[model samples]
Target chain A: TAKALRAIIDAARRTFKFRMNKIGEPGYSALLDFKDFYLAITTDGVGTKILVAEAVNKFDTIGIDMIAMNVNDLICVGAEPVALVDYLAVKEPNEDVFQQIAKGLYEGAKEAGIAIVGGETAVMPDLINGYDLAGTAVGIVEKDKVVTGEKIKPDDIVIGISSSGIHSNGLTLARKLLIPKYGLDYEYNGKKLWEWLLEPTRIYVKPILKLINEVEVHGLAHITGGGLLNLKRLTKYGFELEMPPIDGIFKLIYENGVPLEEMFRVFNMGVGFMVIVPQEEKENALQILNKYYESFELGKVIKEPEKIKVKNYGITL
Target chain B: TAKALRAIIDAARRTFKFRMNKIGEPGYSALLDFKDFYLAITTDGVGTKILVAEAVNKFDTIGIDMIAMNVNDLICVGAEPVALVDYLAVKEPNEDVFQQIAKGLYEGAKEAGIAIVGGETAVMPDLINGYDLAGTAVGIVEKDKVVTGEKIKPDDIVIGISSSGIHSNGLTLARKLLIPKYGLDYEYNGKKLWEWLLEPTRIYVKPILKLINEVEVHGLAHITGGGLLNLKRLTKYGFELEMPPIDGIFKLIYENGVPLEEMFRVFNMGVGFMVIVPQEEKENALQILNKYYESFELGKVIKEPEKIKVKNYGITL
Candidate 1:
C-alpha cells in the first residue's frame, strides 16, 4: 500500500518537475529568486484532521492546524513566515461552523505572528463530505540567509521537539486504528481521545526564526506526514536517532497493533520538529527552544550508508 | 437560491472582518501593508469545475482554472502576480489524474508568467468525493501604485473584456439546469459541450498588468462567482451596462429557462473582467486591451442611487 502511494506521488512529482523549468527540484516550498531575497510559498491542509474536528463538534482549533501545517513548512527553508490565506471546501454553508473556524484561524495567526490576510470558502454539497481546511503561506529571507541543509555534516546534532499529541499528521492511520475502539469521546488521561487528537499543531515559527539568527543552524525539518523520513530532504547523510520515549497517544496506537517500524514510518512518534545543528551549538539551540517547547537531543548525523537508522526501534527507512 | 447564497456569504464575511484586526474590508484579495509596499494574497478554487473535469475525465485545463481564479483576484488590487501553491484533496491516489492536473497547472503558470512553486497532494478518502483543486497566490505592489476603488468617479468608463467561455464559475446552477438534457458529451458548434465548458478561465494577468502600466486604470474586477455583482466592488456609483451579445454557451443556459436576470446574476454572460477608466482614457484603454482581448464599452459609472443596471436584460440589482 505504501508502495502504491509512493508510486502515485512519484508520478505526480514528475509532473511538477517537468513544469517548474527551473534550477532546483520542488521541496517543502517553492522559492522565487528576488535578486536580494527569495520568497517562499507552501500549501497544506490538515488532511483527515477535519473529520476528527467534525466528529467531536470542535471547529475552533482546526484553523490552527491549517495555519500550522503551512507556516511550519515555510520556516523549513529559513524564511520568516509573513502572511497566509486559507481555503475551506464544505458540504454546505453553515454560519456557526464558519465563525468557529475563523476564530481558530485568527488565534493561530496571532500565535504564529503572521497575518491572516485573505481566504476563499466554498459550499459544495455533492463534492465534500464535511469539510477540508488548507492554507498557503508566504515568507521571505535574504538570499544569503537561505538554508538548504547543504551545510549538514557528520556529528551534527539532531534535536527532537515534542509535538502536541498527533499534531495534524497521520490522522487517517490513527482514525482507522483508534477511533473504532476508543471512540471519539472515550476518555484518555484527563481528556477525551478526540480532544487530545484535535490539539492544534505547535507552531515553531517564533523560536526557529530566533534560533536561526542566533545559532549557526545547519538544517531544519518539520516532522509531518513522512515522520523522520522528512530529514532525508536535507542530505544524503544517514541519521542515527536514539529516539526519546514514545508519547502516550503514539504508544496507544502501537500497542493497538501497528508495528514499531510502521509507527515510525507513518507517525511523528513524539517529535514534531527537528533541528540539525553543529555539535557546538546544540546547547545554545536547546536553551532557546526549551523556553517555548520541550526539546532534547535525539540523534546525530551519521555516515551509516545513507539511510535513517533509528536505534531504539531497530529500523532503517 | 442566489439570494440565500449571497446571504450566507454576507454572514461569513463578518467573521473575516472580526478576525482581520488590521484595517480595510475584505476585497477580491487580502492585502497587508508594509509601509513602502504592500503584499497581496488570495485563496480560491475551481468550485464545481472539478465535477465537470471528472465527468469528462479531463483534468489538465482545470489547473488553469485553479490558477486563473487566484491570480486574477490578486491583480484586482494591482499586485504583480508572483507565485502560487496548490492543495489537492482526492478520494484516492491516481497517477494519471495527477499528471493531467499537473500538465494543466504547468500550462497555466506558463500563460500567467508565474511559478507553480509548491503544493499539497492529499489522498483524503473520507472527506473528498472526486477531488477539490484550490490555490493561494502571492503578489506585491508598491504602496503608491496600489489601486483601491477610491479613485473611481462618475463618468468612468467600464470596459468589458470577453471571457474564454463559461469560465470557472456558476457550474452548480449550470449542471442543475442543463446537464440533464444536454449531458456532458452533448455537441454544439462542432464540439462537445463539455469541451466548451472545460475551456480554461482566461489568464488576465498579462493584459491587465500591461494596461495598468500604459493607462490610468482606476478599478478592476474579475467577473467570477457573483457575475455582474463583481462590478459593485469597484465603486458606490451605479453601473449602466449596455452589454454586447451574450456568448453562445450563456445563451444556451438562458434559453434552457434560467431567468434572464438569473443568468447575469450567476454566469459572466460574456465578460470575464471589468476595468474602470476615465472617460477620456477609454479609447486608449480599449486600444491597448483590444490588442490582447476583445474589449468594448460595456457600462459607465453613474450616480443613479448605487446599484447595477443591466439595460439589455432590463434588470436592476
Candidate 2:
C-alpha cells in the first residue's frame, strides 16, 4: 500500500509539472464536508442525444439517462439520493413524449431506490426544439461519511470497475460524426445506435452503499466527462493506472475521429469507477466490488503530483 | 366569522357546479394526515413577462417573481415552503442575466425562509426570443394541519390583507392593455408603469406563518390570476366580497380593456391573502393581523353555491 501511494504521488508530481487548466475556475468540491443528510444534487441533460432520442421514439430512456447522470455522481460522492426532479422543455406540448418520459423517470427513480418527489414538465415548444431532459437529485450522507478522497494516503488500493457504455457525455461530438455519416435511423451492428445511445444510466446506489460500509474505502470517482482528469478530483494524492481493459463501445467511438488518446482523455474508456483503499485491503475490496461489478487493480498510488497513467496513453505525474 | 364562512362555502359550491363536468383535469393536491403534510401543486409562468423583462434592462427580479408566484400559492394552502429549484431559458448565453436571476432567487429564498437548493439554466438561442423563468417549490404541513375549506363549516370570518401591488400575475393582460396603447416606456401618473409592474412579488411567509399559529385559521387563499376564483381551491366555502378596496394599479389595468369582471377574475385587486378564522377567534386574529397589515372583514363564508358577488359591477352570488 505504501509503495502504491508513492507511485501515485510521483505520477502526480510529473503531471503537475505540465498541466493545462480547463474551466479555469473552482468547482463544486465544497460538498465534501456536508453533514448527515440524505439528499444530493447532480445536474445533467440528454445533450445531443435529444436528436437521436427524437427519431427512435425512446424519450423514456433519456429520462433515465438524466437520473443516472446525476444519481450516479451523487453516489460517487457518497450520497444516498432520495428524490429526483426533472425540467423538460419542448417545441410544443407533446403528451406522448411526456408520458414516456415520466414513465422512464419513475422507473429510474425506482431503480435508484429514490422517490420521484414531483418535477417540472414545461411547455416551451417555441423556445425549444424536440425537448431537453435534465434533473437535480437530492440525497443524504453523514458529515464525516461523504467519500471525498481526503483521507486517501499513499498505498491505497485502486480498484477500476467497468462502465456500462458511453453513458451520457461526448454525444455532442458523436452526433457530429455518426448521425451525418450513418443517418439518424441507421442501425449499426444489429442495433439502432440511438437505442443503445439512450440506454438508461446504470444506477449504483444499492451496491455502492453496501460496499461503503464493508470496504476500507478512502475515496470513489465517477469517470464522467474529461475522463482520466476526473480521477484527479478524488484526492490530492496521485493515481497510477497501468492500463485497464476497454470495451467495444469505446473502441467503436474512439475510432470515429476521437483519437484513442482523446477517447481516454474525454470518455470513460469503459472504466466507470476508480475506488481507492489500502493495499492490505485490496483482495477484500476486489471481492466486494466484483460482487456487483467486474473489477481489476488498475495501479498503485505514486509519490508524484496528481497524475493517471493508461499504458499506451501515459499521464505524467 | 359565521357569515364569512357561509359566503365562502356558497361561492365554492357555485364554482364546483359551473365546472362540474369539464374535460380538463385539475392539478395535484395531497392530504396526508399522519405525515403532517398537505400540499396543492399549481404550475404557472409569467406568460408574457419575458417580453416585458427583455424590453427593460432588469431581468433579475423576474426570478423572485417566479419563486413568489409558486410559493405564495403554497401559503394559500397553509403549507410552509421548504425548498425551491428553477428553470431558466434564454435566447443566448448571458452570464450576467444568469447570475442576476440567481441573486434574486437567493433574495427570494431569504425572504421566504427557505433554501434555494438547486436549479437548471439553459442557453437556447434559436428557440427563444428572450427568456422564460419557471420554478417549483416544495412545502410541508402537519397531517392534521391542512387548511382546506371543509373546516370553514359556514360563518367563518374572511379577512383581507393589503397587497404591495400587482404581484407577478395578470401581466399577460396588463401588457395587452398597456403596451400597445402607450409606448413600451410609457409612464402613468408620476411612476413608470413598467417599473411598477415589474416589482418583485412580495413574500407572505412571515405574516402567514404568524397567523397560522396564533389564530384558528380555517383556510387561506392567494388572490392571483383568475382572482376571486382562486378561493374555490381553499374550500367548498362561498365568499361574498361586498367589494374589497381596489388600488390605483388595478383601476388603470382594468380600465384598459380588461373588463370590470375580468379585473376581479384576474388581479389580486388590493388584497394578497384571504384568511378565514373561526368565528370565536375573529377579533383576536384581526388584532394579530393588524400588527402586520390593513385588516378588513370583507365578507363571510356561506352555504350558497359557488357564485362570487362583487358589489360595484353589479355581480351577484
Candidate 3:
C-alpha cells in the first residue's frame, strides 16, 4: 500500500523547494511566506467515505467530512483557516445530489468559520463511477506563532480531543468487512450500522485553534487515516500513554477481525485530535479545550526515538 | 445539463457572504480581503483530457493542464500566483505513472512562476477509473488593482492570445467522435491525433501579469470549457470579433462532424485567452503580449447585451 504512496511522495519531495520551514516529508500544510503571516494551504478528500453516502443515498454530511478532512489538516500548523474551494468529479449531472452536497458544504463552512469560495464541479461520465469530493483550504498563521514539532521535548503532555465516530479514513476496509454481512440498517450500540459509519467528522477548528492561541502548544496533529502512527509526523520523540476507552464503530471493527495494532494503526480509535503542551500548561490547555470539546491527557512525549507505545493496549508502532 | 449546475450554484450563492466585491455569481477567483491585498483563489481541473492521456500513456503534460486551468483563472483577476496544490484520484497507483505526473507538475509550476507547494493522492479503487487530476491555486493582487470587468465600455479593444491547440477542454466530444473511427494515432495536419489533443494547456501567467502591472486592463477571461460563453462571466457587454483561422485540432474536430456553432461553443476555437482594454492602451498591450505569444486586437466590446458575434465565421452565440 505504501509502495504506491512512496512513488507519489518521492516525486513530490523532489519538487519541494518554496516551502518555508517544512515539517515531515511535505508537512501537514504548505506554509508560504506571505506579508506578516505564513499562508497555509492544505488539500484533501473524503476518500471512499463517500461510497457509504452513495450506498445509502445520504449526501448532506459527506460535505462536512470533506471540509473536516482539509481544515483539520490546516489547523495542525497553528493556522486559522480562512476559506476553502471544492472539486467534485461526478459520473453525470444530478440536481438533488448537488443540492444536498451544497447544504453539507454550507453547514461545514459555518462550523469551521471559513468561507466557501470558488469550486469546480467536473462531470466525467467515462472516468468516474459515482462521485469523488475533494477540496483545498487556505489559511493564515503569524510567522512567529507557527507550531512546528521542534519545540516538543520529553515529558510534555499529549492531549486528544474527542471524535465523532471514525471520521473519514479506514472506510474502504471497514465497509468491505461489515457491509456485506450486516447491511446498512443493522443496529449496533443504539444506532444503525450506516449511521455509525456515516457520522460527520468533528471539526476541531474552534477548540484546537483557541488552545493554540491562548496556551503554549508544542505540537498539533490531527489523528486521521493513519491512526496513532500520525504522532510520528509531529516529532521523533516517542509517545507512551493510555488511550481512551474504545467504543462504537471502532469496537465493532475490532470485534469483527481487525487486530489491535492494525486497528490503532488504521483508525483514530476514539480521540480525533492530539495536542502536545508543556507539563505545567496541561491543566490550562485542557480547560480551554474542554469548553469546546471533551479533551484530556492521553500520554506524554518520551525520550525514545520514533517509538509510540500505547500502554492500555500493550501495542507499539 | 446546467440545471444541475444551477442547483449547486443557487445553494452555494445563499452562503456567499464573505466574498469581497463579487464579480459573477461566484467569480473566476474568490477575492478575499487580506490586510493590504486581495487573496485570489481558484480551483479547476483539466476535465476529461486525461482520458486521452491514459489512452496514449502520456502522463507528463496533463499536470500542466491542471495547473494552467487554475493559475490562468487566478491571473484573470490580476493576481500573481504564488503557490498551488493538486488533487489526483486513481483506481490504483503505479510508481512510473506517479513519477511522470510529478514531472508535469514541476514543469507547469516552473512556467507559471509558482511553487508546487503540496498535493493529495487518493487511491480509490471503487470511485475513480484510471485517474482524475485537478488543482487549486492561490494568488494575491493589490487591493485597488483587481480587474472585475467593471471598466469595459463600448469601443473597448478585445485581444485574443493564440492557443497551442484545443487546450484541456472538449475532449469528451472530440474523443467520442474521432477516436471511435480514426483512433488516437490518426494524423491530420502533421502530428498524431493524440499528440494534438494531449498538448498541454498554455499558462498565460507571465505575459498577463506583466500586462496587468504595466498596462490598464479592464477585464480578462480564460477561454475554458465554455468557449466564447466564458466572456459573459466577465461583463455584460457583447463582443464583435474576427477569430483567427482554425487550422489545427479545431479544424480537425470541425471537419469531422461537429458544427461550426457547436465547436466554438464547446472548444476554445483558435484563441485561448482574451483581454479587454481601453482603446488607447491597445498598442502598448499588443507590444507587451507579443513578446510571450502571438496576440492581436480581435475587435471591440459592443453595447449589445450578452451577445458574442464571431464575424469571421458568421456565428453569434
Best candidate (score: TM-score): 3
Candidate 2 chain A weakest ten by summed lDDT: A22-31
- Count: clashes, candidate 1: 0
lDDT of 2 by residue, A234-271 (tens): 77777777766555555557667677667766777767
Per-residue accuracy of model 3 over A1-317 as CA lDDT, tens digit each: 46766665665555655434432113388887765677788988988788888888999999899889889998999988888888999998888888888889888877887778778888888889999899998887888889889999999999998888565558778888899989999999899999888888889998887887789999999999899888888998899979998788888899998999898888988888999999999899999999989888999999987889889889999
lDDT of 1 by residue, B266-315 (tens): 88888899999999998999999999989999889998857888888788
Please say which candidate is ahead in TM-score: 1 or 2. 1
Docking quality tier of model 1: acceptable
Model 1 complex DockQ against the native: 0.35
Docking class of 3: medium
Candidate order, lDDT descending: 3, 1, 2
Alpha carbon lDDT at B162, candidate 1? 90
* Per-model TM against the reference: 0.88, 0.77, 0.92
Report interface Cα RMSD per prediction: 5.2, 16.3, 4.3
What would you estimate as the lDDT of candidate 1? 0.79
Candidate No. with top lDDT = 3
Better of 2 and 3 by lDDT: 3
